[model samples]
Target chain A: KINGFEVLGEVAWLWASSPLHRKWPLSLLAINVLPAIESNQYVLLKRDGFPIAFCSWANLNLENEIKYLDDVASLVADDWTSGDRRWFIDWIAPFGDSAALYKHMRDNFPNELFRAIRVDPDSRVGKISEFHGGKIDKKLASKIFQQYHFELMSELKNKQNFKFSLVN
Target chain B: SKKINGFEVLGEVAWLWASSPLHRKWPLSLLAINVLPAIESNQYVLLKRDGFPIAFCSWANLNLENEIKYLDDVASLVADDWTSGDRRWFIDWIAPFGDSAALYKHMRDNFPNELFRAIRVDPDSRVGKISEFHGGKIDKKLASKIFQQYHFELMSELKNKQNFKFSLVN
Candidate 1:
């Protein structure tokens, strides 16, 4: 169990095969994902003793300049992002049904404005593209976090803006 | 006679400083402190000159602690919480015989693309003396504390292993 949550297995092991999170080294758990889980903002979906999907959330102040979830995964730990009020879908691996997972997120979180990143289906961006996007509202940072997800949202609460780029 | 080699197993250099005050007293700690560098990315570098282990540094040790958060700007490849493959080797420990400037230079050259988070050598240690002479900062207390923590973690894992063996043997 990590922090108070009962994980189906190791978070690294559960998420290892994810092409999106492959670049995220497990060595970073001591600081990032574990705390995010500890906040009880995350939920793990299971079926028949196996994990079907996993999703985590973070509270960030969107009025601030945001680059990546890494910038604020820990910052939001003590309190939400330092500047504005925003809910972020930090990472989600929907191994099962996307609609079910989307509905889960749609129902959760505070009513405040939020953002998520998704990779486009056809583009292969990295050599590790084999190891590791898109914008449909239903896609919603599913399977991985992409920089482009931040750009889709408008009328963000805080002066916070996402410093996004098309290239890796 | 100075040369750098990838540390594969426990070598004379580990034994060379086995008696030093800077080393941990526990056997498990000593074994892992050296062993981790061998398996972790194969970047633990050992420097030898004229058949003696002169100095050594394990860049893998740097990110093991929480201080890596402060080095975000220095390492462009490092994200706020995670590190890319290029900058994975974080510098934490260095033991230099006399002058360590050459050792540091070699370490930088070995991984030209990697950005070193920090170089830590005990200020009171033989390695620290050269770094101090060259006006580098040293943290003896943190260095000792880090190794001690490593030792404690190793012991805990060993106890877990003991349980496995006990169940199998019984």
Candidate 2:
């Protein structure tokens, strides 16, 4: 999540970028799920270094291709630059059950704090969440990823804000 | 319009470009060989090329243009070093056509998801684990055994089991 105010893109892109970021410059990507838990602790598994689901989190906003996300957290994430924000849901897929990740989230981080939002089956793409409701399209994420920091400004690269644990 | 299947041809090219140490003094990845500059992976053949035994391919107007505007672009990118001050290392792009029927037949039996299936690895996926190299040297392998169970919600957003099956074989 390096593009808010401090160029942190968001939360997911950091988990990526270690191995292949040199070649392709981007990923299918993980979505920004609300870490209603402590302070930015979410779930991650290594399919091999980087495991991204073609996915998104609810309660975010992203209608147009590129726009500043309007949220206090987004404000804090990008260094408190309100209008200068990054992607929320990025591009979410609406094909799964409402909050499909919730059950898995609960199962994994049982002690963590998070809430599962409702998924209205009939909501079309762009009509869904605060993140402009839609599947986090792979094509769009590339532009977002590049715009945030194609020039090598990353939180995960030099910053090291989070840690990863191995899943079975 | 959906006439072909995919196996990330660009990534395959990148791996090839990185293989030859002597050939790759050019200081770039195969992704650098951005010839046909389309917007997304679905479009644009990735850019730039070496100063060697490399290629860009088109099948019945495979990627960017209706036909590989190849020679023109090659002329633009290369005075093919081989043909010019360099040696004959420019293994140029090969543009062939009419492989639709064969590809259709292949995927119809193999992937069988409309036109293509970039993945078939999840146990829930009915098509089985057929990647570009599933049958080749760098196979991605099938999912089962240790893959499941210990699973720390290893799931990505695939919801892989959701099968909107093929209407028919080609």
Candidate 3:
């Protein structure tokens, strides 16, 4: 349980014909592990006590990623040109090469990273810039960056062969 | 060493410094301190004396040696802004490092385009409650400076926007 939130764990096993990506199954395993860190999140990895090698975060709804893009586009739209738009599109284009990565992150769960709880406007923590068409400000961007960093660091730290030098 | 316009480019210097197996053999503490001025202008985050989170600043899009060199330019701008006590200086500091000058140089010079965000925590800010949580000794001056210089004001502004939240990690 994390912060008084109950979480359950599951496992998956799979065999695929692809040798270039033999370890592709690990991503499925990683998804199951998220609940161990986050609270009130349920993750089902194996079905009927059998290992399922791949699971999709498509259901996870990575809204925050889209929201961020929308927010950024909107924030800079007045000054945004065709060149600026192409820059962002081109920057993310390479990740598309990794089918597995794109399948899980973009195709499956585009909204998972994009969703954020709206805060009270009257409060100090209100939406600052509705950039890409969603709300994202400097502070939110900082928090998102920091959050991903911690998550990545936490994952790396959990491994026995974890070397800090590899991160740089 | 590559020299352009009287400047010596330390290509992948940080990687070299980090890759040295005998990092402990050198006075890393001193070297790190000396490198601070350069990093501060080009980067946002700095390692604390005890290696804990204290001050939080942001830089975006840092990828190349030339990109790293741009920190000097950034520092110059920062210095000018500091002389005027402008908060926009702080905003400038938070600009994404990867998309900025240095990162663009790194990508164009070496690899294909890539994105990166750099940040640092101030040593002074990791004090009292923060230090206690992280299991470190508190330096009140550093802590208060972190709060006053970066955290408090940024957070206050963030809160006004209803955009983000801050939590004390120790």
Reference-based lDDT, residue A21, model 3: 23
Off by over 4 Å in 3: A1-168, B1-7, B12-146, B163-170
Model 1, position B97, has a per-residue lDDT of 51
C-alpha RMSD of each candidate structure in angstroms = 20.4, 24.2, 25.0
Docking tier of model 3: it is incorrect
Candidate 2 residue spans exceeding 4 A from truth? A1-44, A48-76, A79-88, A91-102, A108-125, A129-168, B1-170
On lDDT, the stronger of 1 and 2 is: 1
Task: After the best TM-score superposition of candidate 2, give how far the Cα of residue A34 lies from its true spot, in angstroms.
Answer: 16
Give the alpha carbon lDDT tens digit for every residue of A1-168 in model 1: 312323412343344445555344332332344545666666666565445666664555443324343343335355543443344444555374556666666665323234554444488321112001123343343423343234424433233465456996
RMSD of 2: 24.2
Query: In candidate 3, residue A140 scores what lDDT?
Result: 62
Locate the minimum summed-lDDT window of 10 residues in model 1 chain B: B1-10
Displacement of the residue A138 alpha carbon in candidate 1, Å? 15
Clashes of 3: 61
> What tens-digit string does per-residue lDDT give for candidate 3 at B63-136?
23222233324332322222232121222121122223443333334433222222233448742221211102
